[PDB]
Structures are given as C-alpha cells and as structure tokens.
Write an enzyme that holds these catalytic residues in place. Structure first.
Site: not given
Ligand SMILES: Cc1c(C(=O)N[C@]23C[C@H]4C[C@H](C[C@H](C4)C2)C3)nn(CCCCCO)c1-c1ccccc1
Ligand SMILES: CCCCCCCC/C=C\CCCCCCCC(=O)OC[C@H](O)CO
Ligand SMILES: CCCCCCCC/C=C\CCCCCCCC(=O)OC[C@H](O)CO
Ligand SMILES: CCCCCCCC/C=C\CCCCCCCC(=O)O
Length: 449
Positions: A214, A223
C-alpha cells in the site's frame, strides 16, 4: 636442502587414480568459473555494479588456481616434474597467490555488503566502478608480495625445511597460516554484523508487509482509482472534495489534525482496519473455513488480498480457495497466476502467491536483491571454511610433529578438497543470484539465433 624426489610419493595404480580425478575436476572447475567471468563481463547491468566486480575477481582467482594447481600437481606427483629452483619457486608462488586472492576477494565482498546495508545513501557516493577496480588492484598486488616471498630469498637455506612443501621453511609456513587466520577472523567479524543488519531489512509483520504493498503516507493521498486515502490504505471519503476528506479524518482521530497525522496515530487506525477485515472474513461462509486452516504468516497474505479487492472479490477464487485449505500450495500458485488479478497487478500478486507457497516473509524486504546477495555470500563462506579446514589442520600439525609417509599420502588426496570448493561456488551463484540467472537467459538468445 632435501631433493624434490623425496616429496614425490605415489604407489603405482593409486597415482593413475589421481591422474584421472585431478584432470576431470580441474577441467570442470575451470569451465564452470570461465562461464561466471563471461556472464558478468557480457551483461551491462552486472559489469557496472561494484558488487559484481568483486564476484568476478573470485571467479578469476578460482579459474587461474584450477589451471595452475592441476597442471603442477599431475606434473609433480604423476609425471615427476624435474623442476629447477627458479622454475619451482614461481610455480609454488603462482599456486599460493591465486589462492590468497580468493580470501582477499571474499573480504572485500563482505565489507561491500556491510557499507551497503549499514550506510545505504552514503554507499553510492563511496563505492564507485573506478574506486572498486583500484581497491581490487591493491589486493592482487599485496597477494603477490606475500606469496612470492620465498622467490625473493626466503627459502630454507640454514633454517629448518617443511615436511609437505619443498624449499619452503617452517618459519614462513607458520607466518602464512597466521596471516590467513587473521584474514578469516576479519571476514567472520564483518559477516557477524552483515547478518544482523540483513535481518533488520526483511518484514516480520502485517504492518511491515502492507507498508511495501500500500505504502505508508502520513498526509492525504489519492489511490489508483482516485479516492482520497491516508496511512496504510485507509479510505476517508467517496466524494471529490478535500474538505469532506479532512472532516472524516478529524472524526477518525478525535482532534483537529489539519490533514497531517503522527506515525503512532497511523498505526492505531491500521489496527482498527485489521480488526474489521478479520471480523468480515469470519462472517463470510467461504472465507471462514480457509482462515481456520491457514497459519499466522499465510493469514496475513489473505488479509492483504482483502485490502486490495474486498471480501466479495477474494470469495471468487472457488477452485484456488479449496487448494489452499487442502494445503496444495503448488497447484494453487499456478491456478491464481491464470487470474486477471495477476494480469492487472503482476508485482503485488507475485509477492502474495510466493508467501502462500513458502510460508515465509522472504518476498517482502527493502533492497531484497542486495539482502539476497548477502545471503548467498554466507553460504559461499561456509563451504570455504568446511573444505579448507582438514587441509589447513594438517599443515598446522606439520609444524608440531614429524609426519609419516602414509599421512603425506593422505594430504595429496586431501588437497583435492580445494578443487571441489571451486566447483561448488559457480553452482551456488547460478542457482541463488537472480541477476546472474537472467543474464544467462539473455546470452543464450544471441548464442542460438
Ligand atoms: C593444497 C595446497 C597446496 C599444494 O598442494 N601445493 C602443491 C605445490 C606444488 C608442489 C606440490 C604438488 C603441486 C605443485 C601442488 C604441492 N599449496 N597450497 C598453498 C599453501 C602453501 C604455503 C607455502 O608456500 C595449498 C593450500 C591451498 C589452500 C589452503 C591451504 C593450502
Ligand atoms: C590519492 C590518490 C588516489 C586517487 C583516487 C582516484 C579518484 C577517484 C576518481 C573517480 O571518482 O572516478 C570514478 C568513476 O566515476 C568511475 O566510473
Ligand atoms: C572456528 C571455525 C573453524 C574453521 C577454521 C579452521 C581452524 C583450523 C586451524 C588449526 O589448524 O588449528 C587447530 C589446532 O590448533 C591444530 O591442531
Ligand atoms: C595473472 C594475474 C592477473 C590478476 C590481475 C588483476 C588486476 C585487476 C585489478 C586492477 C584494475
């Protein structure tokens, strides 16, 4: 001075046995090392790295030794080489030098890893392609200074002569063994610290695993799909507003953050996310029996898949999910590789699949090709200390007490361990180092076509 015929110990058909063994091992050792030299010098990615130039120097030292040692052994012991004082001293000097440069080459390879793993940003400023070649230059020269000392006049004229080596005195033999013992201690001391640091690089947590995948960020980010996110993939809002994301953040933490959080605050949020992931898996009919069968490391790998594609997505691998429960790690690895998840995100999927296959954290590490090279050197050092020990232990015994004829016979066959050691090294480098592995694949394309 005792004649060279007194050291020439052989008993008929036993000499013909060394004649076929020394020839076959010596030919195989030279051909294995000359491949490692070609592969490094031919591959653009390897030749420029100072780490691979030290490995190349070990391959050269082993290749020169294999040729010198086998041709001087079969000539001395088998064919009876009637060599004069000057010719013999440079031969024994050539054998010692090519062997000393191997220990030296290893020492430089072990300090190269320490500086890389101990001071990472300062390494590129310190170790350079040119500076490495100069350092390799001093070593080869020092090796020739120590080894060619009997050729300079340090032979056993009035001083007592050695048992195993013609013209060399016991005061030189003891001095060379003590020098080699100090180089070995230096390699051990450094490799002791190298292991300690190399260990601190690999992940041992879900927090450390998910930091690599991540990416830990302490300020609001976007994202792949464009949603406002913070920490280790914590979703703030589904709306395009920053103010909406900022308000959701201040409610999640319990204070006016102003878009910036503390590392301890980020970990507290992550621990709330993991609890919600696990509770979800328990309340899923398909995921519950799989979580129950998997071990602690493998469970962290399934939680990782949930963070990436949700519970409804992970439950879609019906045939893989059963293979995982049945502990068929190999059949599930190939089944999950044929998925679109693998096609879309190759790197994340490859790291996850290998964890499900091995049950280790070995795929998750900062500078993993540098850590894996430090792991390869350790196995090379271990083989060296195993193979040279009986040979060195007999030489130390050679200084203490008078040796029998049968013991001298054992040393001739014992020294064959120096030739197997040089054969074990190019197999380890061709099976563990990925950069040497891929360089051989790209070279075979030009050799065939
Ligand atoms: C196994 C070995 C040998 C060795 O066998 N050398 C020979 C040199 C020469 C005479 C005779 C037969 C042939 C040709 C090999 C002995 N030489 N060395 C170098 C150390 C000698 C110190 C005195 O100059 C070794 C050797 C290699 C690695 C570790 C320990 C010893
Ligand atoms: C004191 C004299 C030593 C001179 C030391 C040599 C100076 C190093 C030069 C250098 O930095 O060049 C390396 C080059 O980048 C590689 O590609
Ligand atoms: C510690 C690692 C052992 C490997 C290093 C090789 C140790 C052998 C050195 C040696 O010959 O010393 C033993 C004794 O002093 C003579 O009988
Ligand atoms: C024969 C000896 C060959 C070894 C020479 C090694 C020198 C390379 C380093 C200097 C640049």
């Amino acid at each position: 001075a005792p004649p060279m015929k007194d050291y020439m110990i052989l008993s008929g058909p036993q000499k013909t046995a060394v004649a076929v063994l020394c020839t076959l091992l010596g030919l195989l050792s030279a051909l294995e090392n000359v491949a490692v030299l070609y592969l490094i010098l031919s591959s653009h990615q390897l030749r420029r790295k100072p780490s691979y130039l030290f490995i190349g120097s070990l391959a050269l030292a082993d290749f020169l030794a294999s040729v010198v040692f086998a041709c001087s052994f079969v000539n001395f012991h088998v064919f009876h080489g009637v060599d004069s004082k000057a010719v013999f001293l440079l031969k024994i000097g050539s054998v010692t030098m090519t062997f000393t440069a191997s220990v030296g080459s290893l020492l430089l390879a072990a300090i190269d890893r320490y500086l890389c793993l101990r001071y990472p940003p300062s390494y590129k400023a310190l170790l350079t392609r040119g500076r490495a070649l100069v350092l390799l230059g001093i070593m080869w020269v020092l090796s020739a200074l120590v080894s060619y000392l009997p050729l300079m006049g340090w032979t056993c004229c009035p001083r007592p002569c050695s048992e195993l080596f013609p013209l060399i005195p016991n005061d030189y033999l003891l001095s060379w063994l003590l020098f080699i013992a100090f180089l070995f201690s230096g390699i051990i001391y450094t490799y002791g610290h190298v292991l300690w640091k190399a260990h601190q690089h690999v992940a041992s947590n879900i927090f450390e695993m998910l930091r690599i995948d991540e990416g830990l960020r302490l300020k609001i980010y976007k994202d792949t799909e464009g949603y406002y996110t913070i920490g280790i993939g914590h979703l703030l809002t589904k709306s395009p507003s920053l103010n909406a994301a900022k308000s959701e953040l201040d409610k999640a933490i319990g204070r006016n953050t102003n878009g910036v959080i503390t590392k301890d605050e980020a970990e507290k949020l992550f621990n709330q996310d993991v609890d919600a992931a696990v509770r979800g898996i328990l309340r899923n009919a398909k995921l519950k029996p799989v979580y129950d069968s998997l071990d602690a490391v493998r469970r962290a790998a399934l939680i990782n898949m949930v963070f990436q594609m949700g519970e409804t997505g992970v439950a879609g691998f019906t045939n893989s999910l059963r293979m995982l429960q049945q502990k068929r790690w190999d059949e599930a690895a190939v089944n999950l590789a044929k998925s679109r998840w693998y096609n879309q995100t190759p790197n994340r999927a490859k790291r996850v699949i290998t964890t499900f296959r091995t049950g280790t954290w070995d795929a998750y590490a900062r500078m993993r090709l540098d850590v894996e090279l430090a792991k390869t050197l350790g196995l090379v050092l271990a083989v060296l200390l195993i193979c040279w020990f009986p040979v060195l232990a007999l030489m130390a015994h050679s200084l203490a007490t008078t040796l029998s004829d049968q013991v001298k016979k054992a040393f001739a066959f014992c020294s064959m361990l120096c030739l197997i050691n040089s054969m074990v090294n190019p197999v380890i480098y061709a099976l563990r180092s990925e950069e040497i592995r891929s360089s051989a694949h790209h070279c075979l394309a030009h050799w065939k076509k």
